[PDB]
């Protein structure tokens, strides 16, 4: 048993919620939240906006010194930094930018990431500002993620596109 609640069950180990990340991560305290990274990790919008000014920019300080260390991520890479207020770590996983036109078949080498880990709270990846299709975006989820993922889906509207759809 874990303490997420108000969840639609889609597969064994995938569910959906309609709940803003940024709320959900403050309640949970999950072990791993995902973040909407990009490869520079900076965090100015959508998911990962949302996160670090929860986190007060501790999210963006963080980030700017594993860069200047390690330097950029890759698209379809991850790597685990502090959680700060939100969850224990924090998973920033790239997922492609159709807006910047990457490949979206590293749309399932980003969600294979979230396999190192045994439970999630995560958002859609490369949906939303990132330029795809969220049905596929959640479709690529349900056949690459085998660990225990809690997707939180932003809004109602959203929420309802997804789950109608769902074969
Ligand atoms: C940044 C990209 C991946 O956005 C996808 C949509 N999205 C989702 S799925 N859950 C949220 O909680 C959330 N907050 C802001 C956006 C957002």
Redesign the pocket.
Known sequence: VNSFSGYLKLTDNVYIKN????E?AKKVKPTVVVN?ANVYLKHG????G?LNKATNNAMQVESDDYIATNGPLKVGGSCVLSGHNLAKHCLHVV?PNVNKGEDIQLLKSAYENFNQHEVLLA????????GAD?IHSLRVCVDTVRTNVY????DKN?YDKLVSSFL
């Open positions: 709940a803003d990340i940024v959900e909407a919008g959508g998911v990962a949302a997922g958002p859609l990846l490369s949906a939303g500002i990132f969220p997707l939180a889906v932003f959203l």
